[PDB]
C-alpha cells in the first residue's frame with residue numbers, strides 16, 4: 001500500500017482499513033483523483049520559486 | 052556549508068537568516084509561513100536583539116528580493132537544555148507578514164508518520180545556509196546548499212563523543228569534505244519528495260565541521276510537529 005510507491009500519492013499517505021488514503025500539506029487540495037495535490041494559491045509551500 | 056554548491060535563483064526560498072544588531076548573520080532559520088520562522092533554540096542564546104532576513108542569496112549586494120523582519124515573540128522549547136543541545140527547536144512569530152515572491156517561500160511541514168517512514172528513508176536531504184565554508188574559515192557571503200545523506204542511527208550514536216537524544220538524527224558523510232557548519236545552525240534541513248520540499252530537520256550541531264568519523268546532527272523535526280503546530284497559533 002503506502003509502502004508501494006507511496007500509494008501513488010503526491011504527498012501524505014495513510015493506510016485506513018486496508019486502503020490507501022492520500023492527503024496534502026497545508027496550502028494544497030487533494031485533486032479529484034484523490035492522489036495528486038493541487039496548490040491553493042501563489043507560492044505554495046515546498047516549491048522552489050520560478051518568478 | 053562546507054563544500055556543496057550555492058543555491059541558484061529561487062532554489063532555497065525557505066532559507067531565513069537571523070542577524071544581530073550589526074546586520075551580521077549568526078544563525079539560520081526556515082520559513083514555515085508568512086508569520087513563522089523555525090530555528091534552533093540554542094541560537095537564541097547567541098544574541099540579545101536580532102531580526103530575520105529572507106530572500107537573501109548574496110550578503111554583499113542588495114539584489115532587491117531581501118526583506119528584514121522584526122520578531123514579535125520568540126517561542127523556545129520548554130525542555131531545551133544547553134548542556135546537551137537536546138530539544139533544540141524554537142519558533143519565531145514576526146511583527147509583519149512575509150510577502151512571498153522569488154526567493155521567498157515556505158517549506159512544507161510534513162506529517163510525522165509519513166515523514167519518518169517515507170521522507171527520512173530517502174537517500175538524502177538538503178541543508179543550507181550562510182555558515183562557515185571551512186571549520187576555521189569565514190562565514191559564507193553566498194547562500195549555499197548541500198545534499199547530505201541520512202546516517203544510520205546506530206552508526207551515528209557510535210561516532211559521536213556526545214549523547215544523541217531521541218530528538219536528534221544525523222546526516223552527512225563519514226570522511227567526505229561536505230557538511231553544515233557554524234552559522235548554518237538553526238537553518239533548514241529539508242527532504243525533496245516528488246518536487247516538493249518538506250522540512251525534516253534543524254541544523255543543530257556537530258563536532259567541528261566535516262570531520263572524519265563525525266556527522267552532522269540535526270533536530271528531529273518530526274518529533275516536534277505537534278509542538279510546532281501549537282506554537283504557530285500562539
Ligand SMILES: O=C1CN(S(=O)(=O)/C=C/c2ccc(Cl)s2)CCN1Cc1cc2cnccc2[nH]1
Pocket residue numbers: 134135136213214230231232233234236254255256257258259260261266267268269
Ligand atoms: O565542535 C563543535 C562545533 N560547533 S559549530 O561549528 O558551531 C556547528 C557545527 C555543525 C556541524 C554539522 C552541523 Cl549539522 S552543525 C558547535 C559546538 N561544537 C562542540 C560541541 C558539540 C556538542 C554536542 N553536545 C554537547 C556539547 C557539545 N559541544
Ligand SMILES: [Ca+2]
Pocket residue numbers: 107108109110111112113114115117
Ligand atoms: Ca543580497
